Symmetry: D2
Amino acid sequence: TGLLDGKRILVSGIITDSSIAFHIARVAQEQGAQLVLTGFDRLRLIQRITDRLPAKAPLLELDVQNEEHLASLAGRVTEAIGAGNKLDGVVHSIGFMPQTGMGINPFFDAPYADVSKGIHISAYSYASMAKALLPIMNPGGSIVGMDFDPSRAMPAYNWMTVAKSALESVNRFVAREAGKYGVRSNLVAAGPIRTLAMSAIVGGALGEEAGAQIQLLEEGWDQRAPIGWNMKDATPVAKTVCALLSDWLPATTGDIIYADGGAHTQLL
Amino acid sequence: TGLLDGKRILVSGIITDSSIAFHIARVAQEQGAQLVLTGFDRLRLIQRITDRLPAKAPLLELDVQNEEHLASLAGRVTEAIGAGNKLDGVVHSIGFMPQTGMGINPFFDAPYADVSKGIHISAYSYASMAKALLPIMNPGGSIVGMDFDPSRAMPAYNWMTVAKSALESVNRFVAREAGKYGVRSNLVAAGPIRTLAMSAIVGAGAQIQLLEEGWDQRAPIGWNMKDATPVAKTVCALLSDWLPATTGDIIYADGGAHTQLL
Amino acid sequence: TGLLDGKRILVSGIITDSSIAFHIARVAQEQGAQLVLTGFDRLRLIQRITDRLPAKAPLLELDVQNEEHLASLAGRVTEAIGAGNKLDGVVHSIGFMPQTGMGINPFFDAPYADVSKGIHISAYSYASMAKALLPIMNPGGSIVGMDFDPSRAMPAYNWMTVAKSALESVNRFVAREAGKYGVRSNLVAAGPIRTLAMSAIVGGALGEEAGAQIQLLEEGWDQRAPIGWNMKDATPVAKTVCALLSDWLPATTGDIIYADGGAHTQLL
Amino acid sequence: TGLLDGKRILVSGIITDSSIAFHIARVAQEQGAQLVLTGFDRLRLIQRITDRLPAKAPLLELDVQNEEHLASLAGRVTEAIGAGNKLDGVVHSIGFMPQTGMGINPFFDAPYADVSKGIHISAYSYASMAKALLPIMNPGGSIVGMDFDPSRAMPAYNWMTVAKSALESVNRFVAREAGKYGVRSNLVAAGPIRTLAMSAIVGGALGEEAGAQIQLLEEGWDQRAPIGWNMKDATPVAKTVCALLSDWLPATTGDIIYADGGAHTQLL
Ligand SMILES: NC(=O)c1ccc[n+]([C@@H]2O[C@H](COP(=O)([O-])OP(=O)(O)OC[C@H]3O[C@@H](n4cnc5c(N)ncnc54)[C@H](O)[C@@H]3O)[C@@H](O)[C@H]2O)c1
Ligand SMILES: NC(=O)c1ccc[n+]([C@@H]2O[C@H](COP(=O)([O-])OP(=O)(O)OC[C@H]3O[C@@H](n4cnc5c(N)ncnc54)[C@H](O)[C@@H]3O)[C@@H](O)[C@H]2O)c1
Ligand SMILES: NC(=O)c1ccc[n+]([C@@H]2O[C@H](COP(=O)([O-])OP(=O)(O)OC[C@H]3O[C@@H](n4cnc5c(N)ncnc54)[C@H](O)[C@@H]3O)[C@@H](O)[C@H]2O)c1
Ligand SMILES: NC(=O)c1ccc[n+]([C@@H]2O[C@H](COP(=O)([O-])OP(=O)(O)OC[C@H]3O[C@@H](n4cnc5c(N)ncnc54)[C@H](O)[C@@H]3O)[C@@H](O)[C@H]2O)c1
Ligand SMILES: Cc1ccccc1Oc1ccc(Cn2cc(-c3ccccc3)nn2)cc1O
Ligand SMILES: Cc1ccccc1Oc1ccc(Cn2cc(-c3ccccc3)nn2)cc1O
Ligand SMILES: Cc1ccccc1Oc1ccc(Cn2cc(-c3ccccc3)nn2)cc1O
Ligand SMILES: Cc1ccccc1Oc1ccc(Cn2cc(-c3ccccc3)nn2)cc1O
Ligand SMILES: [Cl-]
């Protein structure tokens, strides 16, 4: 019946009901998955948000910079999905970059302490989550992270672009470790979706250029995509993540699937 | 409910029951699709082979070098699936290269007449099929072709490598046309599978060893050249509604080999 | 001492004094190369054009669709440069696509006979020239062809894009053969330059939409290039080809060097 | 010759006479460049080493983690080359990764503090150097860094691979800043060269897996390269960096040139 019937999937990265992770979780539950959710910092807000999902799911705290949270994560997941069950899926939908690393702030003025924090959250944590969770994943399972194509430089995305390049490389190594467990690791490179991070982090760092943000995104994506691109509709991205979590891409690992309307295949 | 429940899908390229297309068709029928099949040249053999599929499907003749076959194709499909119905999917699983263009024959000795024939069948025909079939495809539909990663040169594959590079470029243009109909176009770059065409590339022990080095040894999840199922499933994923934002693109069903250097 | 002092280099593809090959030849002679030139079809015009180069160079006829021309080419080159001498460099600066394959003509309406002719001239001939000339090339030598980045689809370039993809693949195979002779094979992917083919083939196939060419070129190149791009100045492209012909890129083969102002490294 | 006649070029990264930077410096001086050298930590040893170069050059201290060193660098360079003169070239040939991040140590066991240190030295510093030096670079100048192709995962290189992916992304941003000064930024992705850092990837020349290292390098490079690859010969790499420092690749920026015998263009 549903694409993910019977699968136990962890989903990180929900902060609002616009979050990519919110929509991944919604679609996964519509397709019969049983979820465990993780959230950072504003756990009361996150709980109110996840109440809007179609089904209850337990919520665990995870700040990927906190060693204790990572060291206790598998134990807390095992208790949430029922002792002795394992995960079939893990979704990393997590990122951060300080303001100095984005927007109109000059590229060269971001101090390394800020850039390092962003790389820790946005790239290294894909490895740390895999490390914590692989021992409790079933053969045939799937780890998925969110990418935004960093193969070319661009306005404003700045040091987050560098973090995404690092993430891509990390994914290919995670795939080598995950393969010993019969598990796949892949990224979904999504087109732009209107999320809290889009507005507050990228749009914030733009200051008076945020009108231009929309136009840049329409030029980069909707205009180039042969099938178009709607930044207000996260469903196509969520579906693509669900396809990777399913049994229907069983020979794809260390890889990147582009859910961007085909924009990255067209020059203009 | 199967993945392709209710979808009408054309599948080209069956010649034996090892054909990638045979397995694509098998999996698609297991997932509820209704098929129309096309075959080239050995139509009696192909009919015996397609009898082994889990369900009957009509078989139509198509030689992609034949203009008349392409010009009548939509009409013949429409008659097989019923007036008023359209296709949701098309699978291009077709290739050819003359012997001069592959194997131990020197790269520089393949005459252009042979290379041109191979490119016609293996790359241009992806466009010609799209052209013939897009007018009878539903919005939301999907065209999928088969690729073998040509981004780096390699022994023996020779001018077929060039044909695949051409096919990749063709796919990106087909995507622009197909988008006007609400249709996606993508290729699946599969790892090696033991098919009739594989055994024609050369005529052997060295071929298998190179394929093991290039694929199974590099793939984090391994690669089994006797098992077409993972490739077939990947094609079915592209035919489904579960990759709705992917077009002009290439999905690698190769065990992750192409992501690993050694 | 010029960069190519003492080198014997064949340069194909001169048709006017705007031709990329004209500028390659000019720069190569300024850098001390002795040239052999090849031309197609309008040999009287081409001779008047090559008289404007800074030094005399013999001109040979070569239509790359003519088997007899390819089979006699080595012998005719050897007679021009003298028995006992060999070539150090070969430049392929040749292309064609019939009108049905370009512009506003629908992509799907190009018959294969037209596409095949374009692929023959634009891609296969890179192999056929290498095959004819490698037996009279010195170790350390260099074959260079001209590319236009076909990694993504775009308006108007249509089937020429497909021919360039084929050429890239061909270059990697030519490199394998050329390596047995100690010879490198590479392409230069140039940004747009105002040439007869740009205007009459690409621009002509746009009919009343020719303004669209210039607009797309300005968006794709000058606007994205961190150091800018001037389509009226072939010198930077010519210099880059000369760099490949020299001994200063001795470890680069089967490869593509981008002389495009860095445009292809930038998204917008 | 004189490829770099009259150019003032800064070269970082010499520690022994096997260092890639040593050979970059040697070739650059053979081609008429006037050098300023920078060295980290062992400045007396480095001075004995740089005495073996064909000409004297001043040596300045630079630890790229030290803010004071970066803030004073332009002033110290200007004093060495003379007030009123500027640099035409900068070479970044610097890297580091702690032992936990490389070799047989499990990928998942490298702590982020170690990985961050490596990324700081190996990737962020490319930006920090550009920031310090662009204000004293002439139009037409060139910044070059060293890369090792990280587009696919591989044994042992582990987190250094991730650092190189980050460096590639950094280079494309540096190119956007450098373009405002008329300056190019590019990386050279070199094939393997036997240096001190090479041996440290597996914990020393008699590291546990050193036999496996040699075999993997022969398979990855010399066996795939159409023109071969010799890991004892840094000259082809040095020449390629000099090509980028010269005026002969004037339209290439934000980019990567592969000096690896063409290995990366061949599958097997
Ligand atoms: N929105 C886009 O256009 C777009 C496109 C492609 C990729 N992405 C990526 O998708 C992912 C989700 O971002 P989003 O757009 O949905 O935005 P978002 O703001 O909804 O979610 C980002 C999440 O990261 C979490 N996070 C930050 N610091 C963390 C920490 N220390 N520990 C754990 N979690 C932490 C936040 O709590 C939040 O839930 C990210 O990887 C982002 O880069 C976004
Ligand atoms: N087997 C592999 O390892 C592998 C890997 C990647 C991609 N592929 C691709 O998968 C596709 C199917 O190949 P396969 O390996 O299943 O081999 P195969 O021998 O089963 O099938 C090839 C098919 O091409 C058809 N064909 C040839 N000329 C034709 C023409 N003029 N008109 C119509 N059909 C024609 C044949 O009739 C046959 O059905 C091809 O595109 C091939 O290049 C194969
Ligand atoms: N002009 C650009 O913007 C640009 C950019 C990138 C690459 N290129 C490529 O550079 C090369 C040169 O084109 P150009 O722009 O200088 O144009 P051009 O019109 O100056 O030169 C094209 C050349 O192709 C030759 N040619 C065509 N058919 C031939 C045949 N049968 N045999 C031999 N020669 C034949 C013509 O005689 C002519 O000399 C081509 O490969 C073109 O694709 C051009
Ligand atoms: N050797 C190879 O096979 C190879 C191949 C491709 C790329 N590379 C790259 O070439 C570059 C040079 O490495 P190599 O092989 O010549 O090794 P090496 O050990 O000779 O040189 C590395 C240099 O990095 C310097 N360095 C380290 N920490 C520093 C700091 N805090 N501040 C400033 N400098 C610092 C060291 O002092 C040393 O001079 C690196 O970027 C390396 O990754 C090496
Ligand atoms: C979680 C998180 C933390 C830190 C940074 C981002 C982030 O999440 C993302 C949010 C939006 C995007 C998409 N996007 C790009 C841009 C930009 C300016 C416009 C021009 C084109 C580049 N604007 N919108 C990508 C993301 O990774
Ligand atoms: C249909 C068709 C017509 C013409 C040619 C091929 C073909 O179909 C294929 C069959 C098998 C493969 C995979 N493959 C590659 C090789 C080779 C030698 C070994 C090293 C790696 C290159 N051997 N097996 C690829 C195909 O495209
Ligand atoms: C020799 C030859 C034969 C046949 C065709 C071209 C050709 O030579 C070239 C001439 C110009 C270019 C550059 N270019 C591209 C375009 C187009 C519209 C604008 C957007 C980008 C695609 N317009 N200008 C590239 C070439 O290869
Ligand atoms: C400076 C520095 C700091 C930290 C790490 C490296 C480094 O510098 C390099 C030294 C040598 C290489 C080349 N290389 C790779 C490998 C490896 C094992 C063999 C298989 C292929 C991956 N072994 N040799 C690359 C470098 O970046
Ligand atoms: Cl959707």
